[PDB]
Amino acid sequence: KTVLEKSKAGAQSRFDSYGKLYDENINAGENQAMTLRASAAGLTTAVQASRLAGAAADLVPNIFGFAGGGSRWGAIAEATGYVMEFSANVMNTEADK
């Protein structure tokens, strides 16, 4: 009986240890790190978007004033700017989270 009781205690230790880890899905440190990356990602995205929008201010009137594709020579760069600077970056950011 004593041997079985020691076995029981062994299983009980494992049960409680895995129970606790299971319940504490994400630790405090892990939550702080996730929070910081999420905030940094938001800030980073805001910068990429602000930086592009700032530049866009001098491109928009050329985009509007000229007609054509390759012949405008600027609308494509701004459109592709948005696609890589913002859309691709946001998708990858969300995928990582």
Next chain:
Amino acid sequence: ASRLAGAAADLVPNIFGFAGGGSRWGAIAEATGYVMEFSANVMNTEADKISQSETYRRRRQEWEIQRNNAEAELKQIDAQLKSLAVRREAAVLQKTS
């Protein structure tokens, strides 16, 4: 930070020299500098210092479980040695019989 402080210093007469928001075209650059060079930068930096510490904490937790498993076995074995000793005495009594 020192690289940014230099770049930010260049904007002081451009920020406090103009009343307005985005139309200033100064503050945007200062904000893109600060937010990406320092705020997002440091938050991500700390996020990895934190996850590295958590990585080690999780590793210790797994080691704690394995140590405890071994400990439980040591206790079960001592209990088994005791039950065997009793069995041995019974064998001695059988010899007496």
